[PDB]
């Protein structure tokens, strides 16, 4: 029971965008990678604000009236506004489509980047289950789990204990 | 003993379109297209407009007797005029270069 | 004229918005979003909502 990011998201992760789930003797639970969530929240907020705040426009006017014998000039004004309508509409559609695809890729990269940091810490003291979870080859008490999430897990500390558990599997 | 890496999910029914996929459910989104107006005629940066009640702009400027006289020094950000004003050019004749005059007196 | 203040005004209503685009009305006055004919322009901010069963 309890799988990782390969199979989808977690309804139980409520205090952040990215996080971890653990299980050892002392229990289980969810915990958000607070700092990774911080760094991505700034990036998404900046992207939306840039798309919004960069629209610095000249004063808009509604004076577009010409006299009765100048309908051709009125048509020129009509097609000028048609041209800008087509330009802004097309650019706005593809801006949103392109950025939405990139925003989802941005979250995927952040999730993958937590997965790589844990993978390189555990090295071969754990077995990658392929579903975003790791099978610790040693007892990992609550202090051990916190060290993994803080990036301070020691490979050589549990290295002997993991080696004996691995040769049993072999 | 297990540790997993995962991400956030919720019950949001919101979907967005990407350049590769359509109607992708997302946990949160933000619209950048304003679709609503308050249906009111307002001040523009705190500057009141000029309300013509039921007079056309030429009628108000020339002083059609049925139109309110400008008694005091004033300013306005724009001129609001009725689609079919009740009081216009009461004595028949063309008002010359109205469009050019609008450029001068719409914002004072 | 109502007792309201807006940065963008149209003849059918005020657009008191800093969002960069609007589909309300082709003509306007003031500090206004660009007129587009798009029905929706929704930026994704969160993640793909594909929860595990």
């Amino acid at each position, epitope marked *: 029971a309890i799988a990782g990011f390969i199979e989808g998201g977690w309804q139980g992760l409520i205090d952040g965008w990215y996080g971890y789930h653990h299980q050892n003797s002392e229990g289980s639970g969810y*915990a958000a990678d607070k700092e990774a969530t911080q760094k991505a929240v700034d990036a998404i907020t900046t992207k939306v604000n840039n798309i919004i705040d960069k629209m610095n426009t000249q004063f808009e006017s509604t004076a577009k009236e010409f006299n009765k014998i100048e309908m051709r000039i009125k048509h020129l004004s009509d097609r000028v506004d048609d041209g800008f309508l087509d330009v802004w509409s097309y650019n706005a559609e593809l801006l949103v489509l392109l950025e939405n695809e990139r925003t989802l890729d941005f979250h995927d990269a952040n999730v993958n980047n937590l997965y790589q940091k844990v993978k390189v810490q555990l090295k071969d003291n754990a077995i990658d289950m392929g579903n975003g979870c790791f099978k610790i080859l040693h007892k990992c008490n609550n202090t051990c789990m916190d060290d993994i999430k803080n990036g301070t897990y020691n490979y050589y500390e549990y290295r002997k204990e993991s080696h004996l558990e691995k040769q049993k599997i072999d | 003993d297990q540790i997993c890496i995962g991400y956030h999910s919720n019950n*949001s029914t919101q979907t967005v379109n990407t350049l590769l996929e359509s109607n992708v459910p997302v*946990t949160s989104s933000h619209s950048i297209l304003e679709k609503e107006h308050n249906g009111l005629l307002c001040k523009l940066k705190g500057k009141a407009p000029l309300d013509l009640i039921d007079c056309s702009l030429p009628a108000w400027l020339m002083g059609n007797p049925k139109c309110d006289e400008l008694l005091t020094a004033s300013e306005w950000a724009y001129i609001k005029e009725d689609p079919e004003p009740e009081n216009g050019i009461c004595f028949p004749g063309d008002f010359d270069s109205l469009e050019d005059l609008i450029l001068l007196v719409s914002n004072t | 004229i109502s007792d309201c203040d807006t940065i963008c005004q149209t003849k059918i209503g005020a657009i008191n918005s800093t969002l960069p685009f609007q589909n309300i009305h082709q003509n306007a006055i003031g500090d206004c979003p660009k007129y587009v004919k798009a029905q929706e322009l929704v930026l994704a901010t969160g993640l793909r909502n594909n929860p595990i069963k």
Partner: antibody
Amino acid sequence: QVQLVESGGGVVQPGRSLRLSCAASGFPFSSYGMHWVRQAPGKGLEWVAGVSYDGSYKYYADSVKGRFTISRDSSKSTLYLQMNSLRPEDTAVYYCARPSAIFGIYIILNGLDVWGQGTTVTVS
Amino acid sequence: EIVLTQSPSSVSASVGDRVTITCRATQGISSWLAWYQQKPGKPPKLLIFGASSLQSGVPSRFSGSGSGTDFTLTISSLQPEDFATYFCQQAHSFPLTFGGGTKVEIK
């Protein structure tokens, strides 16, 4: 409708113990982390402790470490601060504060959008 | 510990003035700054989060700006009900820290 209510403060001799209570209502109390922030008379605001939504993780300022314990009751929607070995420098008005959520996630590290009236603890 | 240095410790002004209060951090806190307004005997009120975002129900005369180390809270046109003490708070990392505070008082 959404507001907290602190209680349990009073006059207390040095070295004694108190437990503060923060009764929450109007919002999903068990989704937010919570914080205690105290203010000495005439002085500024000092953060003392915080706890995650599920109570699994707890953070303390150095000034109250080993003496204060934060905790919460899900069924009672109440937050607690157990204060041991009280000192005259612990004298302050004690607030419980809710960190703001953003993008729909209840991040514990944020601004504090909800505060109670506070409860007064005087150590002398 | 990240320390926030608020300037000035106090300032006197009249109604309609423009008031600037700055908050300086020992290290980069990106955008995780908050501003609070506190009247005597009352709890603090959240005015600005994200170092610029206006909190729902707060007048548009309060604005905040800054990123990383230096942040500024501006009251464009003072009102009678704006005479109080103002605090900046960081939300970058534990422990949460506040600025020394700034009292805005009548001259």
